[PDB]
């Protein structure tokens, strides 16, 4: 109730401000949707402690260890390998260096089916492609072969850095599909 009050104060003072609020319980989220200038499509957001805290534990019952895969993949970690680390600790850390990013796909992906786009991202670009924005907006994770990737859709990637992901925006099926070393895919040929 106290944290809601604030969002009411802040939204009243200047309507279009971006607000992110930490709620404790699930059902309190209902009250935010009543505030006149609250809009999550516009981009305001509420993170709920009881929703995520138990939700991670729940997925860990369906797939052991998954809680850590999630907790690292959505938080900054420092990949700083050193020779006195164990073999397992080094492989683990490189894995903790992974981050999520999003980018618009190149016109080279137009009208592929999602499995083709994923195969190209993984094999050709060295990027893991999870999900896409699709029109009317909705988010889809591992879509079935019945879908086509439409032009100028935004994709969701797991990679080392945002710079590493930019290849998915540049790649060309005519101009660069022949290239071996991926560290040159950004070019004027398209």
């Amino acid at each position: 109730a106290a944290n809601i009050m604030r969002v009411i104060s802040i939204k009243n003072y200047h309507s279009d401000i971006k607000v992110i609020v930490q709620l404790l319980q699930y059902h309190n989220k209902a009250y935010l949707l009543n505030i006149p200038s609250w809009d999550w499509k516009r981009g305001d957001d509420a993170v709920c402690v009881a929703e995520l805290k138990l939700g991670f534990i729940a997925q860990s019952c369906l797939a052991p260890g998954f809680s850590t895969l999630m907790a690292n993949l959505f938080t900054m970690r420092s990949y700083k390998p050193t020779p006195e680390m164990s073999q397992w600790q080094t492989d683990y850390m490189r894995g903790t260096g992974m981050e999520m990013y999003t980018e618009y796909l190149s016109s080279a992906f137009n009208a592929l089916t999602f499995p083709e786009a994923a195969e190209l991202c993984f094999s050709k670009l060295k990027l893991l492609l999870l999900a896409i924005e699709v029109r009317e907006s909705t988010l889809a994770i591992n879509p079935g072969p019945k879908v086509k990737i439409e032009n100028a859709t935004q994709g969701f990637f797991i990679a080392e850095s945002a710079e590493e992901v930019k290849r998915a925006f540049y790649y060309c099926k005519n101009c660069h599909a022949n290239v071996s070393d991926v560290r040159q895919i950004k070019k004027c040929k398209c």
């Binding site: 534990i57 997925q59 797939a63 052991p64 850590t68 938080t75 999003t102």
Partner: protein
């Protein structure tokens, strides 16, 4: 001990303060200087700590739609209209719902697949992660995220999470693969 083993029981624990992780497990490269994300009980997934959630605020600011991808994966799809149906205070309404509704009973979900047996076993037998990745997606439409592997490679029932291996990374028939599936 259970007669006819208590260390073999899998469990997950809330930690309310991060430094307490050191107590959960004894045998360790103890190193109290190590921050949580490197400690053995965290890297195994036996621990979890609510401290992670404040880092999500930071990420959701820098990268807005990413938090929606958390909630789709985590909750099995707590939609806005489900939140509205709960907001009407009546509790969850239900019945033998229509085929037009039940068409949503084919979302994607997290699963683990073992390389010990079934149609992937040859990749477990000294293959490379990219061979498995391309094969599995191709034949099953199933998307592979990482490995859950034993520490005492030979075992102790304690493994560790490798997020997203490189293409050439070698597999063992003991490994388990995190995957996104329709099965």
């Amino acid at each position: 001990t259970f007669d006819d083993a208590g260390a073999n029981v899998p469990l997950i624990t809330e930690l309310a303060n991060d430094s307490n992780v050191q107590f959960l497990d004894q045998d360790d490269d103890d190193d109290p200087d190590t921050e949580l994300y490197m400690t053995q009980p965290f890297a195994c997934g036996t621990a979890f700590a609510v401290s992670v959630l404040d880092s999500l605020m930071s990420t959701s600011y820098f990268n807005d739609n990413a938090l929606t991808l958390i909630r789709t994966l985590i909750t099995g799809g707590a939609t806005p209209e489900l939140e509205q149906i709960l907001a009407e205070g009546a509790g969850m309404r239900g019945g033998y719902c229509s085929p037009a509704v039940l068409a949503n009973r084919d979302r994607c979900r997290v699963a683990q697949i073992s390389l010990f047996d079934g149609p992937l076993a040859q990749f477990g037998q000294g293959g490379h992660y990219g061979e498995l990745f391309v094969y599995a997606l191709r034949h099953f439409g199933i998307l592979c995220i990482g490995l859950y592997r034993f520490r005492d490679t030979n075992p102790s029932s304690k493994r560790y999470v490798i997020t997203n291996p490189p293409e050439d990374f070698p597999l063992l028939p003991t490994d388990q693969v995190y995957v996104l599936t329709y099965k």
